[PDB]
Design a protein around this ligand. Structure first.
Ligand SMILES: Cn1c(N)nc([C@H]2C[C@H]2c2ccccc2)cc1=O
Length: 360
């Protein structure tokens, strides 16, 4: 319940993700590694791309083993491609273990590394089902749990240069206030959850909740914003527009221009652990209005579903309880609040037909 060694082990810059220090090979080579709950490959810079501070030098590692296979990863607006192998991996500000993990040595990329960023690789923390090239390539966390006695969970306190904590194998009670509330992981592929109701300021959207999860709702540290299906984003914006009648152009709502409280709180009710029981997590404009005093509207549309990104996660201590296929949310001890409104996790609530909120 206390892991001081791991507190404050995350750094980053706004909009460029949160990274943890890791070492790969023998002797250990230090890299900064982006923490990504929305993918499942451990992949690292292995060549002197000009944006890279450093990169994995396989020729220096006695423990490197070639898998003699490639892997090609296109994503929304970019790509990476690499060469698979395994090597010894540790986390200096994490548990005192060393694991043999799969590593993709990145040898070609496009719009993947960021000019001016301070990380050199990515740690995919989601499940094997979305691993590349297929589900046979064991994700890092699976390897860590299989080879050591680290419990099958991790938790994230994303604070917002930004800071935070990744507690590997446990929960640190100093990182949150009040109680953790858990929502089931619906399917172990992404960290998929079911949103059951949406309020802005207090007002239900009265949408068929099946929409809120079309075709997915995921928890993703690798995304900055809260991302909504269009049909849901359309209605969501509509009410935030009306909630904010006192004062902005139409492009601002599409995040096509920047804007330099009158803003409503956003509540998502998540499926609870018990039949007909839910809970709600409440966030602020502080969360969906991120400084770029110009701010970007941090809610946007998706064809792949709801994405609960740093906009949501920075409100809360988030527990990825893999052992029990559930994700816990508590008010984060670091979240940024004013004197009037603070982020909230409240339950229980009575919500019927929560099964119908998910898409098959
Ligand atoms: C939202 N998202 C997430 N979570 N992961 C990826 C994986 C491609 C790798 C990635 C992570 C972070 C930044 C850029 C690329 C793509 C991506 O678009």
């Amino acid at each position: 319940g206390s892991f001081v060694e791991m507190v404050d082990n995350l750094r980053g810059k706004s909009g460029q993700g949160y990274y943890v220090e890791m070492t790969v090979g023998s002797p250990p080579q230090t890299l900064n590694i982006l923490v990504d709950t929305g993918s499942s490959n451990f992949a690292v810079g292995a060549a002197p791309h000009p944006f890279l501070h450093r990169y994995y030098q396989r020729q220096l590692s006695s423990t490197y083993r070639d898998l003699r296979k490639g892997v090609y990863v296109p994503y929304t607006q970019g790509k990476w491609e690499g060469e698979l192998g395994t090597d010894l991996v540790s986390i200096p500000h994490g548990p005192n273990v060393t694991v043999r993990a799969n590593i993709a040595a990145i040898t070609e990329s496009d719009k993947f590394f960021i000019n001016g960023s301070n990380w050199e690789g990515i740690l995919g923390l989601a499940y094997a089902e979305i691993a590349r090239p297929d589900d046979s390539l064991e994700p890092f966390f699976d390897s860590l749990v299989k080879q050591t006695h680290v419990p099958n969970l991790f938790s994230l306190q994303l604070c917002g240069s930004v800071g935070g904590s990744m507690i590997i194998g446990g929960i640190d009670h100093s990182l949150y206030t009040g109680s953790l509330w858990y929502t089931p992981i619906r399917r172990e592929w992404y960290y998929e959850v079911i949103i059951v109701r949406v309020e802005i300021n207090g007002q239900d959207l009265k949408m068929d909740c099946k929409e809120y999860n079309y075709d997915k709702s995921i928890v993703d540290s690798g995304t900055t914003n809260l991302r909504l299906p269009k049909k849901v984003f359309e209605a969501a914006v509509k009410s935030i527009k009306a909630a904010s009648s006192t004062e902005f152009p139409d492009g601002f709502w599409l995040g096509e221009q920047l804007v330099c409280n009158i803003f409503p709180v956003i509540s998502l009710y998540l499926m609870g652990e018990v039949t007909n029981q839910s809970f709600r997590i409440t966030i602020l404009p502080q969360q969906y209005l991120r400084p770029v005093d110009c701010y970007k509207f941090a809610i946007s549309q998706s064809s792949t579903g709801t994405v609960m990104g740093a906009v949501i996660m920075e409100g809360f201590y988030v527990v990825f309880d893999r052992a029990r296929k559930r994700i816990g949310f508590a008010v984060s001890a670091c979240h940024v609040h004013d004197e009037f409104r603070t982020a909230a996790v409240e339950g229980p609530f009575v919500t019927l037909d929560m099964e119908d909120c998910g898409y098959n």
